[PDB]
């Protein structure tokens, strides 16, 4: 199986230099093809940045020329992207991809989110959202988790470690005062809760955070 | 600097019917070797762009018979014979004939669904948060359609607009509905000065708004 994967900081200060690594497994970046770095801006616009051929030659997008660099380490089978004097306008998801507009060869990485900002990394606060006296009639019960005050993106939310996913809606984070707030709701039949336990797991990579919160009812 | 214009920007299609997206460049994409370098990418929510078509009509490995590509020079078209739920996402057309390679704005495909009234649930602040001196009241309006939804908060009968954070989700690829999150944040003190909290929603599904509330003193 073929595969590309990006690695690098998720947070970078403006003016600093962005440095990403793309590792390829299952094919030699020296054999054939051109290896590319593409970025997707929030709003969805994509932007081809540059490439490095299996021969060592590179091509860069004119608008980036002045500050872009793509090199490689053929012995590790990975090529790197270096962008200088990054501004907040460089916040985007960076993908590495390889393809031929002629053959059937096409592979994209998973992408890595890169936020450019002065703000400082901040672990999130997690709060369980239990009904007030909601669980009464209907056979379904909705519960929730509030993830607020973290930075930067992203956080991963699960319920019962993945055990539960059937009816989960995890809402997109909102930036409100240099900090993010996100929420996640889960609806289960009235038989599971509060009978059998329901937990929301939250992980904030940047801050090496791992928090589990059980949704226990309020006595009133 | 070869502009790639797509149309429409957003396409709503009812499951089982054909869909059509149009791509058009500022310059011919026909190359000197007689080959046209135009591809169609698809990006489902939470995932990476995925090529579906190259050389304007050649299908990629694993791409369904449903998709079809055609065009020539400066006008290409992606036709989906019959749409399915697994087709939700953004469609982009790329050009690899003239440097630099450029993409179209992308076309968001939305599934036209049967109207659904939101299921509303409201949550008081958790004692754990109040301790920090903060109070966030949350309101979830799950699985509804269309996306046209309006939320309004009322504390002790009077409307409050400041301190609200709304968040919508992408169309559910499973039932084709949307869900929204509305959070009203107050300080510990202001929350304790009022008792009746109401989350009110107005949607195409009903003539009178859906209401959910709670009294701070009751639990």
Shape of chain A: elongated
Distinct helical segment count of chain A:
0
CATH-defined architecture of the largest domain in chain A: Sandwich
First-last Cα distance of chain A: 56 Å
Report the top-level CATH class of the largest domain in chain B. Mainly Beta
The helix/strand series of chain B, from N terminus to C terminus, equals EEEEEEEEEEEEHEEEEEHEE
Named CATH topology of the largest domain in chain B: Immunoglobulin-like
The fraction of residues in strands of chain B falls at over 45%
Radius of gyration of chain A: 22 Å
CATH architecture heading of the largest domain in chain B: Sandwich
CATH superfamily of the largest domain in chain A: Immunoglobulins
Organism (chain A): Mus musculus (Mouse)
Subcellular location (chain A): Cell membrane
Protein name (chain A): Ig gamma-1 chain C region, membrane-bound form
PDB class: immune system
